[PDB]
Design a protein around this nucleic acid. Structure first.
Ligand SMILES: Nc1ncnc2c1ncn2[C@@H]1O[C@H](COP(=O)(O)OP(=O)(O)OP(=O)(O)O)C[C@H]1O
Ligand SMILES: O=c1ccn([C@@H]2O[C@H](COP(=O)(O)O)[C@@H](O)[C@H]2O)c(=O)[nH]1
Ligand SMILES: [Ca+2]
Ligand SMILES: [Ca+2]
Lengths: 288, 445
RNA sequence: CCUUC
RNA sequence: CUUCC
């Protein structure tokens, strides 16, 4: 009817294998904090599977409210992992974050001097950057840039080891100038706006070898096209082989993400673990 | 309401306008801590005192305070931070002391030849007595906690050869984070000593409780329960040891660490014992073919020095021909990411790396420095560890190895004390040295 | 207050 | 930063 048999979800952007012309005619509750709970549980999980996350400090800029983040925190704590959580954001954070010794809550907004400060402060602890910087309706390329411009600075300053950066190509028809964003895999996000082109730029650093990828409008077309395909054709399909309670692409996608997450508690099949996580996850935000 | 109650019953005073809001979060944590019998505790450290710490300069009324004395600082501590800090630690005692610590109180010589021999082939190179008491606790520990603490290092071999001169009971445990906090207090109490617990940015998942004066009391490595299983575990004396086979592979991987060769050109005998105690184990366990004769060993390792990455040809053993041994972990990681691979096998501080086999090829990171017999020439004692490494994987995954290892060993039997031309500069691991000061009330990571 | 849920 | 089974 509108089903399908896949081998694996499109994990990263380099993996979408088709396009579709964006047509502007363009499903849960508390889903905002979810899209994130995964990309973040996912990002850091890798950093752990590769070590990086060991006793490092996560500097989340553009966090608040950041309800989910608590979950994440509880996850790793429960995992023995050691991490200081620095959340900076001009707006405030979901109270469920106060009183946490492992979490500092800055109620300030970022700029040049500021990074230079915290950097000095935190150093030499290794830093892990998670930017979700914002700027109603949907950011103008004008802002999109200033933001990215700013994210590329945090990077250069906090000179982190790994970083999960917000990344949504600026609409072609509204293009302005080009820019560079750090090199790094771009993961598609589950349970994300029906038609969003947002995706986190996951990138791990070499040390004295930063790398940026020049972004061009030709490049931008590819996005809209490929992305749109994903959102309209891909996600709206049903993985009939995927032996999971829920079979929507996203749940299938969300599966493949958690499959890589770590959890001490002993579990039989993976479906077993994932399913629990999912459960526990949805539990947290409180989604049926 | 019941909330403000707990805060005063804990603060031994009224909470300030702020203090309330802060601690407000620390519900039962703070409540539980309180309606928790201190006495029973006071007597449990005592019941322990005499058993692993019978020989101490302390008294029942003296100690008793310490314990209470600690659970009493809530009333003097006015620094919200220090407050939050002492609460998280009081809670470690409260929930784990009982479960984790309190519970406590309830043939070979043959290869001595080969040892010297294989050892020689190489040889081309250049702490407070609380240690004791503890080393007495740890014994019982491994016994009590089989599945939540496994051991290795020097100690272990003495459990197969009581003729093995060890110093530290080395371990891997799923809760090391707690384990140390507890012990920390154990010592901080009975002793009356102000110890410190630190994490060393260099080692992965590592916290060594040192002494008030930096006297290495005892160090530990933490590992996921996940990993805890895949580890080649062995039983003997109601305690689990890291299967000596495996333990011998690192043996080989260790000696590719020049630093440790400036340690070999020292105690040529020290290792000479642990050594054979291993050559002996397997030879007897899996009847290891011990005849100087041995083919396809030390696979041709090619060290591109411009990328700081080796290239081993496991081919003659495993499906994958090459094994790209990286020397810059932080690199391998990104490239791995680039490989779009997110299910790499990480065996924490064990293998000290994450092995990957994207497209019939093995990618990995060697935790040590590489030995050169000449410019671009990978000194053999390198292909030693290099191999083992892989095998470690092979072992934590249970695969066709016996063969290769036996093969690898024979390649060690009498060889040129080949000169060491140069060596690689191991990638620097970042991170601030974090510690816990039970005494000064400071927590930092 | 002898292993604190 | 030194602090490395
Ligand atoms: N480069 C390495 N990577 C991973 N593990 C290693 C490495 N080098 C040594 N090890 C592990 O450390 C273990 C013991 O450390 P070590 O103290 O140096 O020898 P030991 O047998 O414990 O003798 P002592 O503890 O000094 O009395 C044995 C080995 O599996
Ligand atoms: O978690 C912490 C961090 C710092 N401090 C100590 O408290 C004092 C003031 O720090 P503030 O609180 O940040 C300093 O001695 C600092 O080392 C704590 O007690 N706990
Ligand atoms: Ca040791
Ligand atoms: Ca040790």
């Amino acid at each position: 009817m509108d089903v399908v048999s896949l081998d694996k979800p499109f994990m990263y952007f380099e993996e979408i294998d088709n396009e579709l012309d964006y047509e502007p005619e363009s499903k849960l509750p508390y889903q905002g904090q979810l899209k994130l709970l995964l990309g973040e549980l996912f990002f850091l999980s890798k950093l752990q599977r590769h070590g990086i996350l060991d006793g490092a400090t996560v500097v989340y800029i553009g966090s608040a409210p950041g309800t989910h983040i608590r979950y994440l925190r509880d996850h790793f704590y429960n995992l023995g992992v050691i991490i200081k959580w620095m959340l900076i954001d001009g707006r405030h954070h979901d109270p469920i974050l106060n009183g946490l010794r492992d979490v500092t809550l800055v109620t300030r907004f970022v700029d040049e001097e500021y990074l230079r400060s915290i950097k000095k402060q935190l150093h030499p602890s290794k830093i892990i950057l998670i930017s979700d910087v914002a700027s109603g309706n949907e950011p103008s390329t004008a802002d999109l840039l200033s933001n990215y411009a700013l994210q590329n600075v945090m990077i250069s300053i906090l000179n982190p080891v790994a970083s999960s950066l917000k990344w949504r190509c600026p609409f072609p028809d509204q293009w302005i100038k080009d820019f560079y964003i750090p090199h790094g895999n771009k993961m598609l996000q589950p349970f994300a706006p029906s038609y969003s082109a947002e995706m986190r730029l996951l990138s791990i650093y070499t040390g004295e070898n930063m790398r940026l990828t020049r972004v061009t409008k030709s490049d931008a077309v590819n996005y809209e096209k490929k992305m749109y395909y994903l959102n309209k054709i891909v996600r709206n399909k049903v993985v009939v082989n995927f032996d999971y309670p829920n079979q929507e692409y996203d749940y299938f996608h969300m599966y493949f993400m958690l499959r890589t997450v770590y959890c001490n508690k002993t579990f039989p099949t993976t479906k077993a673990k994932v399913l629990f996580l999912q459960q526990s996850i949805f539990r947290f935000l409180n989604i049926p | 309401n019941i909330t403000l109650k707990i805060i005063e019953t804990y603060l031994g005073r009224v909470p300030s306008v702020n203090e309330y809001h802060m601690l407000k979060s620390q519900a039962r944590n703070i409540q539980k801590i309180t309606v928790f019998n201190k006495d029973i505790f006071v007597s449990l450290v005592k019941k322990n005192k005499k058993r692993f710490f019978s020989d101490v300069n302390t008294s029942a009324s003296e100690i008793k305070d310490r314990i209470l004395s600690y659970f009493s600082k809530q009333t003097q501590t006015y620094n919200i931070g220090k407050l939050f800090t002492i609460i998280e630690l009081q809670s470690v005692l409260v929930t784990t002391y009982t479960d984790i610590l309190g519970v406590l109180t309830i043939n070979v010589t043959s290869m001595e030849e080969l040892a010297r021999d294989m050892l020689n082939s190489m040889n081309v190179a250049v702490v407070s007595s609380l240690v004791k008491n503890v080393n007495k606790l740890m014994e019982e520990y491994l016994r009590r906690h089989n599945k939540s603490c496994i051991c290795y290092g020097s100690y272990s071999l003495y459990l197969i050869n009581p003729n093995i001169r060890y110093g530290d009971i080395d371990i891997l445990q799923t809760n090391s984070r707690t384990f140390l906090i507890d012990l920390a207090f154990l010592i901080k109490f009975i002793t009356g000593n102000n110890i410190i617990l630190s994490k060393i940015p260099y080692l992965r998942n590592y916290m060594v409780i040192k002494d008030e004066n930096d006297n290495h009391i005892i160090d530990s490595f933490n590992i996921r329960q996940d990993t805890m299983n895949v580890v080649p575990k062995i039983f003997i004396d109601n305690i689990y040891i890291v299967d000596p086979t495996f333990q011998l592979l690192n043996m080989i991987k260790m000696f590719s660490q020049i630093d440790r060769l400036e340690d070999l050109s020292k105690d040529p005998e020290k290792f000479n014992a642990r050594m054979a105690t291993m050559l002996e184990y397997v030879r007897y366990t899996h009847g290891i073919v011990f005849d100087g004769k041995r083919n396809n060993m030390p696979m041709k390792c090619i060290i591109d020095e411009n990328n700081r990455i080796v290239t081993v040809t496991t081919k003659d053993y495993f499906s994958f021909k090459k094994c790209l041994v990286y020397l810059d972990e932080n690199v391998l990681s990104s490239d791995i990411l680039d490989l779009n691979a997110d299910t790499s096998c990480d065996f924490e501080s064990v293998t000290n790396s994450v092995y990957l086999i994207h497209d019939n090829i093995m990618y990995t990171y060697f935790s040590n420095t590489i030995l050169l017999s000449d410019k671009g020439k990978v000194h053999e004692i390198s292909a030693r560890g290099l191999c083992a490494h892989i095998l470690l994987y092979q072992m934590l995954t249970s695969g066709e190895y016996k063969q290769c290892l036996s093969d690898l060993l024979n390649s060690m039997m009498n060889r040129d004390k080949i000169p060491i031309y140069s060596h690689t500069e191991r990638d620097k691991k970042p991170g601030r040295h974090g510690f816990i000061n039970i005494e000064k009330d400071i927590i930092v990571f």
